[PDB]
Write a new protein. Sequence first.
Lengths: 210, 1011
Amino acid sequence: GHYQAEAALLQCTADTLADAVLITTAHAWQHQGKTLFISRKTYRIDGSGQMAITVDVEVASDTPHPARIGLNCQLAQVAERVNWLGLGPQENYPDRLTAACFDRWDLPLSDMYTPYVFPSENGLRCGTRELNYGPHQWRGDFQFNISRYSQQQLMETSHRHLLHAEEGTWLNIDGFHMGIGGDDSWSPSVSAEFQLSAGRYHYQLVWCQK
Amino acid sequence: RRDWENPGVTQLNRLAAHPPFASWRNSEEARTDRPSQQLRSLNGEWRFAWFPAPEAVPESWLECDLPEADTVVVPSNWQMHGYDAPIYTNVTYPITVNPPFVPTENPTGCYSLTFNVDESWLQEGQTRIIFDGVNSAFHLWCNGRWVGYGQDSRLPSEFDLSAFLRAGENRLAVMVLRWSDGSYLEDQDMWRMSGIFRDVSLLHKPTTQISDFHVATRFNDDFSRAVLEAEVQMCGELRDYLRVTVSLWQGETQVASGTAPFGGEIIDERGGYADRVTLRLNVENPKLWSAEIPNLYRAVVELHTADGTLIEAEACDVGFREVRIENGLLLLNGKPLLIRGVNRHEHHPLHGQVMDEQTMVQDILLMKQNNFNAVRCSHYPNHPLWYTLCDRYGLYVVDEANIETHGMVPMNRLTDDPRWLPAMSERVTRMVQRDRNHPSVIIWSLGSESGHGANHDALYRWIKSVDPSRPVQYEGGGADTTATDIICPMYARVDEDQPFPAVPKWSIKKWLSLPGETRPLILCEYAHAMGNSLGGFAKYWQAFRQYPRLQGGFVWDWVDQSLIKYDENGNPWSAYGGDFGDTPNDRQFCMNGLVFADRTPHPALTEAKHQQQFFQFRLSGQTIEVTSEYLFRHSDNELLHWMVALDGKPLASGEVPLDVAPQGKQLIELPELPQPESAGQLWLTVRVVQPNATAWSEAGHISAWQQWRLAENLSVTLPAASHAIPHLTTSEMDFCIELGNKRWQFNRQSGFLSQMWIGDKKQLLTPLRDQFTRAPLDNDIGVSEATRIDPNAWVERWKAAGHYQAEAALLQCTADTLADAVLITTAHAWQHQGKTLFISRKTYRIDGSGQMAITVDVEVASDTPHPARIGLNCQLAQVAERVNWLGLGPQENYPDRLTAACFDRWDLPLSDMYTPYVFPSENGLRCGTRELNYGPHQWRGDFQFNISRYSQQQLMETSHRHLLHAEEGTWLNIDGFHMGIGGDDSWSPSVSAEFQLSAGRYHYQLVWCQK
Ligand SMILES: OC[C@@H]1[C@H](O)[C@H](O)[C@@H](O)c2nnnn21
Ligand SMILES: [Mg+2]
Ligand SMILES: [Mg+2]
Ligand code: NA
Ligand code: NA
């Protein structure tokens, strides 16, 4: 029920600090009264205007390990370039990132999308410490992709040529991402060390407008 | 003549070696293995006097006793009585390297004994004396006259005394030299002792006698039919009326018998052996011998006259088993063995190297109960009873020649020298000549750590030629030379290659498939069990299991070679190298055991027991699939015991008998498990139990166990909104958080929780601070010393980068008041010579319910040696009697050594949370702990911890356990992450990459409350 699971709100508080406001949330994702994922966050916005996101996810031991643990959102902005400090320049995933080098990379947006004839998840870059898009900047230690196509659209489209640019830009930021397999394409082939099975996962982001 | 400095003379007038004799004069006695009148022990009180060299022995000592001499027990090592210091040395010879010479100052032991000999023993027949072991060489006198000389301190020297003894009163004089040319061949890694340390006896044989006998068993294709073959040899005057009968009994039934006159078959142009006979008996459906079922038969060899009159009878146990290598596998009775072995030195903490029945029985039961099935005699032939015991209890033995020349440069200097061939050959040939009849001996070994030389090649072939029933192995000169049937490396890693020039240690999985290689691989020494070790043990056993030609190994080693010393109060403490004045020495390197000298198990032993299980399990749906790794036995004394528990609390249990064929499967369906309501993780635990006592275990003995995570219901129900709200008190010095009676002090200048209060009772003695180090284990130290630094060992990389000299520099301390809690945010940087090693960013969150939530986020500089741990520590004032925890236990367990541990609720006395490693190090950690309870305190999270009355600093600074003092209060280390412990070897880094803390950024969270 990973595709069907809906967030239930457990907690949502606000506090005023000396130099910041702190928002504290907690969600459960459930399916048939089974809890799959719990997501405990904090958001810390201070006088500098930086948003310090902290995410703490729990994953039921008996659910099949997730494909990723991350945040997504559709940005209004449509910028021409993408600029990041991390593994690149090409698409790279956890079990396929030896070819990529760590450096400051600047590409056009269309280079962040891989035109696989059969549409799927694509264009992830790993080991990213800084991501720049238009006015936005995310800092931390994550994996991300950024394209004009939602995961939903990719999932529902059987051919690349039938895909259409969505209004705004879809950003996928992941603390963690499952490996991609390949040993074959007819049985589970993602090796154990690239499966998201730790049970509890942590990642922290900082979102500013520089 | 100085025979002890001449390797061409290894004995004078010594009698031919042969298997165990008893010279029974009664068939039944021989059959039932009763004591024999013709075998008298001379063990007991002797007269001994020490000397500094032989030239200092007064010539009167041959003739009559020395008044200065003391009365001491024999056997013994005279080092254990205090006459000189036992020397511990590993590689470097205890003497100057100058072959064949020894030091002029040669500690000489003078043994004498006045004793009776009966009239009937001299009127006719032969009377010999037997010294089962004498270290390292000796001359023998009897009633003043000289008898002979003998070397090789691990095989029995025998001399014919017939013409020396007189009726009634007799006197032996045995001058024993500590050092001889033999000592060049005796460079094993152990204490270097001496004296008459094995049995002494008198054997009376008739003039016409059985002088030797060999037993062999050949089989058909399926082992339903067998021929036993006994060659019997004699000394004395041959006679046309002489006869031999070889009779095979199983228990009390006689299964087969053969009688024949002497006169062998024609062997060449000159005829045959007139003084020999071979008896061939058929045996249908023989009960086959194995470590699984040691079915023994009994062979009686009767020398007697045609008319019926018995002259004498000898006997041995016979196990029907075949040992061969075929298509690259070591088979026993057609089945490919999996060796769960161990090396075992002959060692006792009090008696030195003197062996006894009780200790050997002890060792075997311990080994067997811990799922061992094979032993290697490192590095010498054992006390003779040891083989009788392995024959009967069932252990596969590797019999090793008493040859080791580790100290030489190069290692094969003597073993490649033809002038050393003679000395070496006697050390091999006499081993085979003594031990070839024991079913437990499955493999002969040519010795240890003596490089590779043509002498090895010659002897290897010798064995193959004389005894083709057993494979031959030898490690030296690369572990895969032309002198070994089995690739038997020492400390070869599972995945990692170690490509040393000339003599590389390849990864065992790669080693097998090198171009042209076809033999089986069984490690002669692996998983160095020195102190807190055996990390990475699971990797070997997974590898053994997957690879058919990886057939196991022998762990190093069984028992710590620590000796007993006493302080001023007569209190006993365990001692190692250098503790006797002995120098140069290799300090703690003698204690590599899975057990302490007194046979107390190290935490490492249980890891072995688990990994070496004979039953393998998988879980699919709710089906348990039990797989038997037994080769011959059915699971005829086992029943499976499962239970399902939610965070410690038992929900359901069952009991199903086991009925698996060797190599077979059994499917077991768990009933519908009643799905519980409340949050937490369900855990299934199976364990295999033996309902009945056996020769080796008590009733109810657990032989195997495993766990799986079943369902988990994550926790989704908010904690009920607090009644009260904590109060902050600001101060230029402190932040003080109060709530009810409870108080929390955060020193604003250090940045740590300095003190906690319950009413007016102090909790903390030292404040709660991060810790990124541990007290170096042996595998952390390696071979690094004060005078010889090895910059590559873990302890030294940590030292040089300042991990131990690092001081916390406060970056940030702030307090904030929330709706229902107080929030402290702290930040620290640890530095050294201006290099930031670690950054620690924490938050403490104290709510109305009186629960404190710590959030730790550590950074580690990529270029600093990966830290030994990432955690928190403090000294609690409280000292309680118990420790209660929800996590892996019950015994000590580390990340790369936690497979044997089970998740459950564990209650133990505080004392059991400390492990008395003789050299103290970081110890007692338990992993995957979700809840810890100490007195009033409770910590929750997902962490590792250890808890004791010794600080990390004390354990670090103290050399022996007996010098540790309990400190005020209780020290607690709570690790978010802990480095592995290594142990593939103990002389280079051995912590596998996946167990080093290299992530860079680490996260853990705690909840601290007083329940
Ligand atoms: O416990 C030290 C061990 C032990 O002496 C072994 O017999 C030998 O293979 C060795 N080589 N280097 N260190 N060792
Ligand atoms: Mg000699
Ligand atoms: Mg050695
Ligand atoms: Na194997
Ligand atoms: Na050793």
